[PDB]
Structures are given as C-alpha cells and as structure tokens.
Design a protein around this ligand. Structure first.
Ligand SMILES: *[C@@H]1O[C@H](CO)[C@@H](O[C@@H]2O[C@H](CO)[C@@H](O)[C@H](O)[C@H]2NC(C)=O)[C@H](O)[C@H]1NC(C)=O
Ligand SMILES: *[C@@H]1O[C@H](CO)[C@@H](O[C@@H]2O[C@H](CO)[C@@H](O)[C@H](O)[C@H]2NC(C)=O)[C@H](O)[C@H]1NC(C)=O
Ligand SMILES: *[C@@H]1O[C@H](CO)[C@@H](O[C@@H]2O[C@H](CO)[C@@H](O)[C@H](O)[C@H]2NC(C)=O)[C@H](O)[C@H]1NC(C)=O
Ligand SMILES: Nc1nc2c(ncn2[C@@H]2O[C@H](CO)[C@@H](O)[C@H]2O)c(=O)[nH]1
Ligand SMILES: Nc1nc2c(ncn2[C@@H]2O[C@H](CO)[C@@H](O)[C@H]2O)c(=O)[nH]1
Ligand SMILES: *[C@@H]1O[C@H](CO)[C@@H](O)[C@H](O)[C@H]1NC(C)=O
Ligand SMILES: *[C@@H]1O[C@H](CO)[C@@H](O)[C@H](O)[C@H]1NC(C)=O
Ligand SMILES: *[C@@H]1O[C@H](CO)[C@@H](O)[C@H](O)[C@H]1NC(C)=O
Ligand SMILES: *[C@@H]1O[C@H](CO)[C@@H](O)[C@H](O)[C@H]1NC(C)=O
Ligand SMILES: *[C@@H]1O[C@H](CO)[C@@H](O)[C@H](O)[C@H]1NC(C)=O
Ligand SMILES: *[C@@H]1O[C@H](CO)[C@@H](O)[C@H](O)[C@H]1NC(C)=O
Ligand SMILES: *[C@@H]1O[C@H](CO)[C@@H](O)[C@H](O)[C@H]1NC(C)=O
Ligand SMILES: *[C@@H]1O[C@H](CO)[C@@H](O)[C@H](O)[C@H]1NC(C)=O
Ligand SMILES: *[C@@H]1O[C@H](CO)[C@@H](O)[C@H](O)[C@H]1NC(C)=O
Ligand SMILES: [Ca+2]
Lengths: 776, 776
RNA sequence: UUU
RNA sequence: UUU
C-alpha cells in the first residue's frame, strides 16, 4: 500500500486502485452517511455510496471530482416495502439541477432505490449506463429521453410490482426508445407492462420483459431486432401453484400467446427464457429461423404432455442448456417418465434439467433418448418424488460430470430458492461442492435406509457420491461400497452412522475426503460402542469431517492415519473425553501423523487439561479452539506445538495474553483472539515475536496499549492488525498509541469507523484517528 | 414481604422465612464473597455460603449468629480438578479453633469441597449432621471422632478418587465408628477403601460403600447391622466396558466376592445396590433372611446367563424395583430374550428394567413370565438393538403405565447419562413427559421408516405413543393410526413428516397433544406442497407443537381449529410468509378460535408487517415474539389484541417503549423486554397502566428513569420489576430513582448485586442501593 | 465449583 | 436496504 499513503486515514471508505486503467475506486457502502464525505480524493473515478442516508445531490456533490467514470448512488432512499422498517426513508432523494452535467467522463450512473418520480435530467452525453431500478418511474415518454443518445444500457425494472406498487399499468409512448440508436440492453422487468413496447431500436442485444402483465405477443413485436441475443418473457401469465409471492394468472388458465412466426426476425438469438408462462404447447414453428439457440428455459409451465412429444427439439441441434423443470400436471403422480424420442436430436446438449416432473418409478430405458448425446454433462432429475430407480442405469452415463437425483423418495450448483424465486436475477442494494473430483452421483435427501454392494454394481467409475440426508442407520463393516473402487469423495452427512465396526469405509480404497458430519443420533445414547479408530484403514484419506456429532465417548482411545491432513471435529464433546483427571483420551489425535489442520471449536472446553498439547500430532499447523467458552489458557503449553502457525482462539472468555509470545511459540504466524474479554495486554507481549504476521485483538475490552507491548520491529512485519470494538481510554497515558495509530502504515481495518474512545468526558464516541492530544 | 422490611436491602443474599419452625434462612450462594457479609441478621438460623472465596473461618465468623441450626459452608476451596481452572483456589480453607464450639443449637454442618486435611475439631455436641465430601481427609482415627457422640449423619466420600486423588488406600482404625452410638447414615463412597470398616454401630440405617477398592466381603462384615435399610456396594470390582471414567477391574475378571451368608443379619434391608460388581452368579442363599427387600440393582454385571436362570427371584416376593440393565456378554448379540420362569415369583414388582441385554428379536411369548404380575407398572427394554418385535404382544400389558422400547433398531424418566455415570448420586456445589395421560408406548429412537394401521392392531388402549426420532418420511393420510382410538398424546418429533395431505392424523380422534417439531426435512426443499390446514379435523386437540421445522411456505393460507389452545411455532420462517407486500398469510392463525398461547419466537422477524395483529385470533393471551431480531414495533397495534395478558419481547433489538402503555393495551399484565437496546423510557410510559403486574426491563441500556415514567400508583401494584444489567447514570438528575430504589418495597431481584452505576467518575461499579447523593 |  |  505505498500508493495509498497519499489518501487520508480519516476517510470512512475503502480505497483501491485498478492500475493500468488508472481507476481510483472509493467504496462508502453502508457507512451511515448523511453527507458525501469531504476527503474523497480528487482523482476518484469509481465512487460508491450505496446504502446511506444522503438526502440530496447538488452541483456541490461532485464539483471537485472531475474524473468520475462511475457513480453508484443506489439505495439512499429505498421504497417503504423494499427497505428497513426501522430506518424508513422520510422523503424521496432530491436531485437539484446541473448535478451531473459537469462530469465529462461519466460512463455509468446508478440511482436505483431512491424513490425517484421521473428520469433524472441534466445527464452528460458521455453516459453509457443508466440504472433506475426500484424507483417510482412508471411512465416512459420520448420527451424525458432526449439527453440519452449515447445510452447503451438502461435498467428500468422494479418500478411497479407487488413490493413497490404504482397502482396503474406501465406506460411507454409509441417509439419511446427508437431514437436511442446505440441501445444494447433494455430491462423493463417487474413493471406492470401490458404490451411489448414498439418500435425498439434494432441495435438491442438483450431485452428483459419478464414478470409483467403481457398477455399476448403480436407477430410484429420483435420484427426488427436482428441483433437480439437474449430475450426474457418469463412470468407473463404465470403458473401460480405454490408461488412464494402473490400471483395472478391470466384469465381461464391461459398461456402467454405467442404467434408461431413471432421469433422469425431473431436470427442471432442465443438465449430464450419462457419460464412461468403457463404454456401447454411448444410449437416447433417458433424455432424455424433460430439456428444458434444455446439456452432455453421452459420451466414452470404445463408441459408434462409436451415432454413426451416435443417435436420442437428437432429444430435445436446447437442447444447447450434446456430446462423443463416443474412442469407437472397438478394433482397427478405419473407412473413413470415419458421422454420423447426427439431428445435424441439435441446433439450439442450439455445441461438438461427436469426437476418437478413428478413420477413414481425411473426405469433404465426411459432415459434412452439421451444415451447417445455425446456432450451431455449434467442431468438433473431432482424433486421428482421418485420411489424406485435402479441406479445401475447410470452406467450408460459414465461421460457425465453430474447426475443429480437430489430430493426424491428413493428407497431399497443452483441456489436453494431457484425455480420458485420471484426474480432470481434481482440486484441487491449491496452489490453489482465435490464436482471437481470427477463424475458425481447426487442421491442426497432421499429415503435410503439400507445400502449394499449390489446397489452400486456398474458404478465403479464414480468419483463423488453424495448420500447426505438419507436415513442410513446401519453398522457399516467395509462391504457396502465394494464396487466404488475409484471413489474420491463421499458425503455421508445427515445420516445416522453407527460406528460399531472399525472396518467402516475401508473398501473405499481411493477415498480422499469423507464427510460424516451430523450423524449425532447413536452418539447421544449411553452404553453404545463406537469405534473412532476406523481411520487407520483409509490409506489415501486427506480430509475427514466429523462435525456436530455430539461425540462424548469412544471405545477406542486413538485415531490413526498415515495420510490424514485435515480433521474437522467441531460440535462434539471433547470436554467430556478430556474431563480433568481422565488421561485416557489425551492422545486421541497423536497418531494422525500428517495432520496439519485441526478444528476443535464448539466443543464446550472451559479449560484444556494438561496433556492436550503434548498429545497433539507433531505437524499440527492450523488449530481452531474457537467458540469453546475457554476461560483460561496456559500459553506456555504452546511450546509443545512446534509447527503451529495459526491459532484461532476467537469467541471465548480469555482475559489475558501471554507475558511473552516469543517464549510460547517461535513458529506462530496468525493469532486470532477476537471476541474475548482481554482488558489489557502484558508489558512485553509481542517482544521479539518476529515470525508474527496477523493479529486480531478486535472485540475485546482493551483500554490502553503501550509501546513495550507493541514494538515497531514486530508491527512493521504485520500484514494485518485488528483493534476495533475495544474500550480505548484517551488520556495522556494513551499518547504513544494515539500517535502511532495516526501515523503507522500497518493495515488496521475499520480505523476510521470503529476504533473509538469510550472516554474520558467529551472524548467519548470520538475516533482515535481524529484525536488532537496537544497537551501530552 | 412485610416480615422482610426489617432486613437490609444491601445484603447480597436471599432471605426467606419458614414460619412455624421460626427459621430465618439466608442464602449467599455464588455471590463472589471474600468475607462473610456484615448485615446477616442476628436471628439467622440456616446460613448458606456455598461457592464463594472466603479463605478462613474464625470465632468472629459466627459470633453474633447464636441461633444457627445449619451452616452450609461448601465449596469455598474446591480441589483443583473438581474446580474452576480460571478461579483456582490458592490455599486450603483455614479453620481457626473455637469457630463452631460456641453454637449451642447447630444441628447441620457442611464443609465439603474445602481441601480440608483433617476432621474439624471444636464441634458442638448438638451436631447431628457433618459433611466433609470432596476434601483431602483419607485417614479416619478414633482420636478424631471424640466430639461426635450425638452424630447421626456422616458424609466422608469423594476424598480419594480419580478426580481428587490421595495416592494411598483409605485408612479406618478398627472400631473407628463403633462408639458413635447414634450413627444412622455413613457414606464412605469414592474413597479408595479396600475393606468394609468394622465393627460398625448397630444403629446404622444407610451405608454407602460404593466406588471403592473392596475386593471381598467377610461373612462377619455386616453381622450386627440389624437396623440397616440401604446398602450400596456398587462399583467395587467394576465392569469397565465403555465406562466414561478411568476404571480398573479386579484382577482376572473377578467379581466382588460376597459369601453366601453375608447378608443374614440384614432383616430390615429395603434397598440393595450391587451395580457394577462384575457378578456372574446371584446365589439364592444371599436373600434367605431378607424378606422385605424392595429395591435391587444388579445393573452393569455379567448376568446374561443368570437372567435365563435366576433362582434368587423366588426369594423376593416383596420386590418393587429390579434393575438388570447392561448385563450383556461382550462381543455377543443374542438371537432372543431368555427370561427365567422365576420372574413370575416377583409378585409385588412395579418396575423392571432390562436395558442393554442386547438381542435381535423379541418374540411375544418371551415375556410370558411377566404376564401375571398384577402390579407391574414399568417395563423398560431400551438400548437392546432389537430389530424385530411384534408390537401387538403388548396387548398382554394393558395394565402397565409405561412400556419403554427407546433406543432400539426396530423396523416395520431416567437422566441421559444414568447407567454409565461414575456417581449418579453425587452432590453439586450449588444444591443439597406424557406419562400422566395414561398408558404409554415409547418407541423413540428406533429405525421405523414406514408405519401402517396393522402395526398398532391390539393397542387401542394406548394413551401416549412416542415415535420421536424415527425415520418416518411418509405422506400420512389418516389411515396409519386407525386402531389408536383412545390416544391422547402423540410425539412425532424428529421424523421427516411430509404434510402433503390435510387428512394427516385425522384418525386419532381423541388426540389432545401432537408434537411434530423437528420435522424440517421436506420444508427445506422448494416446490413441495405442504398442507398446514390439517388442524381442522382434530376435534379435541389442545396443544400443537411445530417447532424448528423451518416452515417458509404453505399451500394452504389458514390453520383452523375449534379446540386448539396452544400453538408452538418457534424456529420457522414467518418472515418469509409475511414478506412485506404479501397479504396472503396474514390470517394464518385467525381461525384458531380458542387459541390462547402462541409462540412465534425465533422466526427471524426484523419487523412485523401491518395486518399481523389484526389477523391474530380473538382470545390470544400469551404471545412470544422473543429472539426474532425485531428492530421496531408499532406498540399502537397492540390495540388489536384485546385479550392479551403476556407479551414476551425478550432478546430483540427494540430501542423504545410505547409513549403510553395504557393507550396500547388495557389488558396487559406481563411485559417482558429483557435483552433489548432500550436507552431511555418515554416520559409517561406506565401512566395509568393499572392492569400491569410484571415488567422486565433487565439487560437493556437504560441510563435514567424519572418519576413520570414510573408512577407509584402502578409500581405498588407490581408483583415484580426487573432492572438489572442496565447502564445507570448516577448524577443528581437520577436522584428520584436512586432514592426510590432505596426505599420501595416492590420486588426488584438482584438489587444488592447487579443494579449498578456505570458513572460518573468514581461512582462507576458502585451499587445504586448504597449511593449517598447528599448534595441533591 | 463434588455430577 | 431492489433477493
Ligand atoms: C469503474 O467504473 C467503470 C465504468 O462504469 C467500470 O468499467 C467497466 O469495466 C468492465 C471490466 O472491468 C468492462 O467490461 C465494462 O465494459 C466497463 N463499463 C463501462 C460502462 O465502461 C469499471 O469496471 C469500474 N471498476 C470497478 C472496480 O468498480
Ligand atoms: C397494475 O395495474 C393495474 C391496472 O392495470 C392496477 O390495478 C388497479 O389498482 C387499483 C388500486 O388497487 C384498483 O382500484 C383497480 O381496481 C385496479 N384495476 C384493475 C383493472 O385491476 C395494479 O395495482 C397495478 N399493480 C401494481 C402492483 O402496482
Ligand atoms: C488408591 O491406592 C492405590 C494403592 O493402594 C494408589 O496407588 C499408588 O499410587 C502411586 C502414584 O500413582 C504409585 O507410585 C504407587 O506405587 C501406587 N501403589 C499401589 C500399591 O498401587 C492409588 O493412587 C490410589 N488411588 C487414588 C485415585 O488416589
Ligand atoms: N452400536 C451397535 N452395537 C451393537 C449393534 N448390535 C449389537 N451391538 C452390540 O451392542 C453393544 C453396545 O453397542 C456392543 O457389544 C455391540 O457389539 C448395533 O446395531 N449397533
Ligand atoms: N409432498 C409430496 N408431494 C408429492 C408426493 N408424491 C407426489 N407429490 C406431488 O408433488 C407435488 C408437490 O408436492 C404435488 O402436486 C404432490 O401431489 C410426496 O410423497 N410428497
Ligand atoms: C407414457 O408412454 C407410454 C408409451 O410409451 C403410454 O402407454 C402412456 O400412456 C404414457 N403415459 C402418459 C401418462 O401419458
Ligand atoms: C438393476 O440393474 C442391473 C443391470 O444394470 C442388474 O444387475 C440388477 O440385477 C438390477 N437389479 C434390480 C433389483 O432390478
Ligand atoms: C450433498 O448434498 C447437500 C444438498 O442436499 C449439500 O448441502 C451438500 O453440499 C452436498 N455435498 C457436496 C459434497 O457437494
Ligand atoms: C432474635 O434474636 C434475639 C437475640 O438473640 C432473641 O432474643 C430473639 O428471641 C430472637 N427472635 C426470635 C423470634 O427467635
Ligand atoms: C434360550 O433358551 C432356550 C430354551 O428355552 C435355549 O435352547 C437357548 O440356547 C437359550 N439361549 C442361550 C444363548 O443360552
Ligand atoms: C403380530 O401378532 C398379531 C397377534 O397379536 C397378529 O395379528 C399378526 O399376524 C402379527 N403380525 C405380523 C406382521 O406378524
Ligand atoms: C419421546 O422420547 C424422547 C427420548 O428419545 C424424549 O426427548 C421425549 O421427551 C419423549 N416424549 C415425551 C412426550 O415424553
Ligand atoms: C391413503 O389414501 C386414502 C385416504 O384418503 C385411502 O383410501 C387409501 O387406501 C390410503 N392408502 C394407503 C396405501 O395408505
Ligand atoms: C386445505 O387447503 C386446501 C387448498 O388450499 C384444500 O384443498 C383443503 O380442502 C383444505 N383442507 C382442510 C381440511 O381444510
Ligand atoms: Ca488532527
């Protein structure tokens, strides 16, 4: 950070630099500002003020800031229902005239979420991007668009919908956008639009008309858009069954009415989204002149019958992605899957998703139309309530990256809300997985209670198997997964593993990662034999996760591995296994010879009995003891951890630091003490601690730091030093620290905002960075 | 509390009165004391000082306190391993001489957990009870027992064991206790005792010799104890398999050796505990002269074979309780249960526990020896890894109160640690269920994935069924429980209920309480139809618990009941169902016409949209909105809840109270605002709020309270007012409050200890009750 | 802070 | 705090 020494440390904003674009970026996101801060550098190019309470903008706002290419002034007055009900914006944002017209270089302007009533005027002709989402602008008129000749990108959505209502239909003047001769992207989503606006500039590449009241498309509506690549008409005549938002369908179960010739102009179309349009038929004719369609979304329609027919697919040999999820006929539970022969035409297909078709049995041959699709990578059949499926059918799908049968009822990545989101592409005010192991079979959240070898016959190619969230209550003995000779990752979390036998999992001879987290069930009942020593047999295991198992007893006293590097053991009861006076489990982790990372956070350890560190394995580097309620800690015992580099002690009740950190651990690089009860440092704390790089003392109760505790020869090595949310006393005794804080180049986050005096007197609440201690 | 106005409010101890015994009880438990407090009333009879740091006792300690009948001075210096590792006691408690000899009326003295080295001398002859547990007294000599002639009760345990070791065998002089001619109870547990001390006073009623190194009983050892009622020899030659403490068995798997005539003197014996004695045989001869034995514990032995034989039981026709739990042969999994014919002799038997026998199949006829035990109430067969059991066999057990099959592997109240506790009867430093509905079948924590009517065929008598913690993933439709016509309580928690059908549970026509908590599984996946309106059909349902289900969607918009009085709905996502601008679920609870208690805590409600309170059902009395992260609350809306009496708003972020509580809710009796961010009250807050009785403002950030906020005509009605852990400013502006706090008789808990100034100056940390504001 |  |  030598380039940053020119800028003031008092600025409550994060400053960064894109060298080679000569951009100075300044980020004042969510800093509780009522004024643009004075201090913003003259050379600032990208300025972000989103999530603040600046009530107006004037020519004074940006007078000095002549180099601005981008202003992000979003969410300073968000509509009532979109916003905080504690911090309700009293009055819309006021933009006085001539506020932007002076910015010759302004390429991007964001004014979303400010309750604006009309399109801001006075905008410079250099402007390429204008964003006005989540305002109250519901009438577009040619008169208002006169200064936007150079505009390429226009975002006008979310100005009239259930969360920001305008109480009328959206109005666009005939030809409103036609004279914007460089317009590439236009978004009119979530707006109560009733007809496609015409005529649109032929230069458009992307048009978003989704979530509106458009009941019909005219054959003329997209006539001239011969450069269009993305069209989204989704959510016009929506499918409302289980919608998690208020939802009015078109009268009489009617689909969005699209004439057969309506897409004929669209020769460049790559992407077509017709999600939630209540479609019953997909006429093949639609696609006659679209030869390069790559992505097609037909989810949330009523296309169950069509999936069995689907003549349209013969016209899509370059399609990469096809989504037909959630097309089930209400109240019907089909016996089986009827996939059309036509799916065999989809020669370029990489991703097929057919969630929510809703059927009882998947027979091997019902996916045969896909067997010869050479490029198919993902087949998603989740959320189908499938009860029966012979998994061996996926031998015909070795070439796939992912076979997803998540959320079904089988017995012997996309975001969680996705197909049922109102607008999954919506912008927040804040901003603008084992697949890498190879072939993956995802059986998570099914009803598998018992597994046996024969279940995985013909699946020896699998690299990752996800059995998370089944019902498996079995004493695994090393015979259940015998065919999975190539398996590298197994997720067995959220089952009810019964570790009676130490031969469990031994047959997975290439296993690298095993997750048996959240199998607490048998660990919670007394008198049950549990063998934690099963690790010995897994000869290439690197990572073992056994979190949230409530482990408080083990019949074996040692875990052993020649290979394991990482062990997550959080949310167990090491406090019970290491009860004071009981030596038996002090060497629990000692024979994990290659162990470098150990997480024993959330284990309810008020104290560590002696023996614990001596019993750690010799290569331990990363140790977490976070969130244990620790109240004391013999720092001297760190001498036993000769390779320790990171010690996470956050979120405990430690009241002291070691007298001499260098006499405790020569190797220690990162020490994390945040959220403890430390009231003072020790006199020579960091002395001679040359190896230290990172030190978090944030969220403690520290009053004073003196120079002897914090020698410069150490501090100037620190990559980072965190000191915020402490109880700093700002008397003349604190003068070294106050001065040092003001002048050091050591990185201290939240320095301007949250390193604050608690006293005395009128110093309360005042940043230490701004403090003038002229009498000391 | 008029009797209590005589005692000082500054006393950091709870004072109470047993009228009619003329006892004044004073409790200073855990108040961080280094001195006995001055202020303890002269008439104090029972004084408790446990869990403090008083380093010595002298004649000054109790000079004034001449009426003391009981001193509880435990745990002022607990042994290192038993105690806090943060607050380690530096030095044993010092008892200077003549400290007790002046107390003519002292009947009970507790000095446990003070690292004492010898038995305290100078004790008054009125003493009936002396307790010295958890000290370092490991040699008993007749010389030391000279002042104890009147002693009835002596507790000497926990002076030499794995958590407080003495490093030698315990020593008792021959005849040590013989001359204590009134000794009734003697406890030598947890002491490294190697032989039964002889000869013991014949007046003994209870003798606790458990958890020791006693390998043999001599035929003479209990010769003269013809009044003995309780004998505990447990844990001498322990069974160590899966012991959760360090455990050395007697050499060569050897049992505790008890001669066949060893109990012949014990004609009064009611209770015999032989838990964890590695017994292989129970010779019938032991019980020849014990005709009134009521309770017998033979758990944690090696009696699996003996349970199939068991001739000793013919000699126990008055036995009420028999425990044979955890007798399995290591490494053996029996095909079935072999119960001896002899169990049919147990004519008085009420409770039989046979956990941990460990067998695969329970056939109907294998319990036939119990069929004609007329008084049998509890049959406990938990933790047996039973895989098969025809539940209809319990038609032969209609008369039982509880049939417990908890923790087995069946596919189509004791504390948690109990049989594996080191000492389940141990004293803490601090102190010294659906069964009521009728017949209960507990199938919790089994492997039941599917249920059907025929499973419950001859079980129509059941009143309570616990299916908690099975694997049930089924769409219940009202046919699965048809035979359970008399069922009143069903616990279906920790399954995976799939509420597709609104007919679920309708067949349980007499159902009063239904628990479907922790069935979150299908609620977490989008697009799944869920019918919360199933409540309509259950015509006598009183209480419905549906906690921690993560509910964020429902196909139905209303829950309906003519009968339901309590609904627990905590740990769901009402925030999503009541998203601002979505009206559809604002009447979710409206048609629960008789609903009086609603818990919607932990539902992630930053705010309540309007409509919520209007949509509450008309008889709502008890509402919890705790732990929601609420940041604002329109108090005026409480007008809609015309019968509200309790409002729990604890653990939120509210920053204000209503301007006028009486203009918000005339009916409100208990208002709970603890753990919020309230900084000041409103000027007339409680004015005219005559109906208020309970008000918790603890753990806020309150600086000042003025008289206008807190009128006396309201306050003097308050049963309780909580004000602790606030941020009180102690200036002259606070004078009304400081004075009022000092003189009111309103109950304010923690007044002496935790109502404290934060400022200004040297007032910091000082109790407001002690504050002298003489200049105001 | 005798479990 | 546009989900
Ligand atoms: C600073 O603002 C400029 C102008 O809005 C951003 O420029 C974009 O940069 C990306 C890649 O970095 C290009 O693909 C876009 O074409 C540019 N947009 C325009 C309108 O010119 C720049 O990225 C911003 N930088 C930061 C770090 O926020
Ligand atoms: C979308 O526009 C419609 C009409 O095109 C709005 O509906 C009108 O709203 C007012 C106030 O609720 C009613 O008095 C009228 O009856 C409605 N008219 C019709 C024809 O429905 C609607 O509010 C707009 N939607 C949003 C979300 O703003
Ligand atoms: C109970 O007494 C035994 C012996 O009676 C103690 O064992 C001795 O302990 C010390 C230190 O562990 C050894 O050096 C001795 O050699 C042991 N002697 C024998 C005879 O075993 C034991 O420590 C005592 N137990 C407790 C818990 O205090
Ligand atoms: N944990 C477990 N133990 C079993 C089972 N079946 C028999 N056992 C035996 O039960 C005892 C306690 O777990 C041990 O002796 C086991 O060998 C089972 O399914 N799970
Ligand atoms: N919740 C649930 N829905 C099912 C099941 N089988 C079919 N469905 C159908 O799937 C859709 C979503 O639940 C509804 O139309 C249901 O009728 C099942 O086992 N559970
Ligand atoms: C599925 O297709 C088969 C023939 O391949 C046919 O018998 C059946 O009617 C189809 N099912 C439905 C529900 O349309
Ligand atoms: C499942 O299919 C495979 C052929 O891929 C066959 O080996 C196996 O026997 C089938 N099992 C069942 C239960 O249908
Ligand atoms: C297994 O499935 C669950 C989704 O049901 C998911 O949370 C988990 O991440 C998956 N595992 C892996 C390794 O991706
Ligand atoms: C209270 O103590 C006094 C002084 O020792 C005694 O005279 C008086 O009788 C006691 N009161 C009662 C009710 O015992
Ligand atoms: C259980 O008793 C039967 C006879 O009723 C006997 O044949 C069987 O072997 C017994 N089992 C064992 C393990 O002793
Ligand atoms: C269980 O026993 C009952 C007799 O009480 C009988 O009705 C039934 O056939 C048995 N059920 C099974 C599944 O064996
Ligand atoms: C059901 O059993 C579990 C023990 O697994 C217990 O938590 C629960 O309290 C029992 N339910 C009732 C109503 O007693
Ligand atoms: C469940 O469905 C209906 C109840 O409405 C019933 O007639 C049917 O027989 C039931 N079937 C099963 C298999 O539970
Ligand atoms: C539950 O709601 C659904 C539709 O929302 C309706 O079909 C059904 O009749 C309702 N059932 C009851 C018992 O109220
Ligand atoms: Ca200055």
């Amino acid at each position: 950070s030598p380039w940053a020494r020119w800028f003031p440390k008092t600025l409550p904003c994060d400053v960064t630099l894109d060298v080679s674009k000569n951009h100075v970026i300044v980020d004042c996101t969510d800093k509780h500002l009522t004024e643009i801060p004075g201090g913003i550098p003259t050379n600032t190019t990208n300025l972000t003020l989103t999530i603040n309470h600046i009530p107006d903008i004037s020519p004074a706002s940006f007078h000095r800031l002549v180099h601005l290419v981008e202003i992000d002034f979003r969410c300073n007055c968000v509509p009532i229902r979109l916003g905080s009900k504690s911090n309700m914006c009293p009055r819309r944002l006021q933009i006085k005239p001539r506020s932007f017209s002076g910015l010759t270089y302004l390429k991007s302007l964001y004014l979303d979420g400010n309750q604006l009533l009309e399109i801001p005027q006075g905008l410079p002709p250099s402007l390429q991007l204008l964003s006005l989402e989540a305002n109250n602008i519901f009438s577009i008129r040619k008169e208002q668009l006169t200064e936007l000749a150079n505009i390429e990108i226009l975002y006008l959505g979310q100005n009239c919908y259930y969360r920001n209502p305008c109480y009328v239909s959206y109005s666009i003047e005939k030809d409103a956008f036609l004279n914007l001769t460089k317009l590439k992207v236009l978004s009119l989503k979530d707006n109560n639009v009733t007809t496609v606006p015409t005529v649109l500039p032929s230069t458009l590449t992307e048009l978003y008309l989704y979530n509106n009241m458009i009941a019909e498309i005219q054959e003329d509506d997209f006539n001239n858009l011969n450069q269009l690549q993305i069209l989204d008409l989704s959510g016009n005549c929506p499918r409302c069954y289980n919608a998690p938002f208020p939802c009015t369908p078109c009268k009489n179960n009617s689909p969005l009415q699209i004439p057969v010739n309506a897409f004929d102009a669209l020769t460049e179309l790559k992407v077509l989204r017709l999600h939630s349009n209540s479609l019953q038929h997909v006429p093949p004719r639609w696609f006659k002149n679209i030869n390069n369609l790559q992505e097609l979304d037909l989810s949330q329609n009523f296309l169950a019958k069509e999936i069995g027919d689907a003549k349209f697919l013969h016209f899509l040999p370059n399609l990469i992605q096809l989504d037909l999820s959630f097309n089930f006929e209400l109240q019907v539970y089909r016996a089986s899957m009827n996939l059309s022969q036509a799916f065999s035409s989809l020669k370029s297909l990489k991703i097929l998703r057919i969630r929510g078709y809703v059927f009882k049995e998947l027979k091997s041959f019902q996916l045969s139309p896909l067997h010869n699709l050479q490029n198919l990578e993902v087949l998603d059949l989740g959320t189908n309530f499938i009860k029966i499926a012979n998994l061996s059918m996926f031998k015909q799908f070795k070439r796939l990256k992912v076979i997803d049968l998540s959320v079904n009822k089988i017995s012997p990545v996309l975001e969680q809300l996705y197909y049922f989101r109102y607008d999954k592409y919506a912008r927040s005010c804040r901003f603008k997985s084992c697949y890498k192991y190879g072939q993956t079979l995802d059986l998570s959240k099914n009803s598998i209670f018992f597994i046996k070898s024969s279940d995985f016959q013909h699946l020896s190619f699998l690299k990752c198997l996800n059995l998370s969230g089944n019902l498996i209550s079995q004493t695994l003995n090393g015979s259940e997964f015998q065919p999975l000779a190539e398996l590298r990752y197994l997720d067995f979390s959220n089952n009810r593993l019964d570790l009676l036998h130490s031969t469990a999992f031994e047959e997975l001879r290439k296993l690298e990662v095993l997750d048996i987290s959240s199998n607490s069930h048998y660990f919670q009942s007394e008198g049950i034999t549990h063998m934690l020593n099963f690790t010995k047999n897994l000869k290439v295991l690197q990572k073992l996760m056994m979190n949230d198992n409530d482990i408080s007893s083990s019949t074996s006293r040692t875990m052993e591995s020649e290979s394991l590097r990482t062990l997550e053991f959080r949310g167990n009861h090491l406090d019970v296994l290491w009860r004071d006076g009981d030596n038996r489990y002090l060497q629990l982790f000692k024979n994990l010879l290659k162990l470098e990372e150990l997480d024993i956070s959330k284990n309810s350890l008020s104290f560590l009995p002696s023996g614990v560190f001596d019993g750690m394995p010799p290569n331990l580097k990363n140790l977490s003891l976070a969130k244990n309620g620790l109240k004391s800690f013999i720092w001297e015992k760190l001498r036993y951890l000769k390779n320790l580099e990171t010690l996470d002690l956050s979120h405990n009740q430690l009241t002291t630091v070691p007298e001499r950190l260098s006499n405790c651990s020569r190797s220690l690089k990162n020490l994390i003490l945040k959220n403890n009860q430390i009231r003072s440092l020790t006199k020579y704390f960091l002395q001679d601690a040359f190896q230290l790089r990172y030190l978090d003392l944030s969220s403690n109760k520290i009053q004073m730091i003196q120079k002897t505790s914090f020698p410069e020869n150490v501090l100037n090595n620190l990559k980072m030093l965190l000191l915020h949310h402490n109880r700093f006393l700002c008397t003349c005794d604190a003068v070294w620290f106050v001065w040092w804080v003001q002048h050091t180049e050591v990185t201290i986050p939240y320095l301007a905002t949250d390193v604050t005096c608690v006293g005395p007197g009128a110093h309360k609440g005042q940043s230490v960075i701004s403090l003038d201690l002229y009498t000391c």
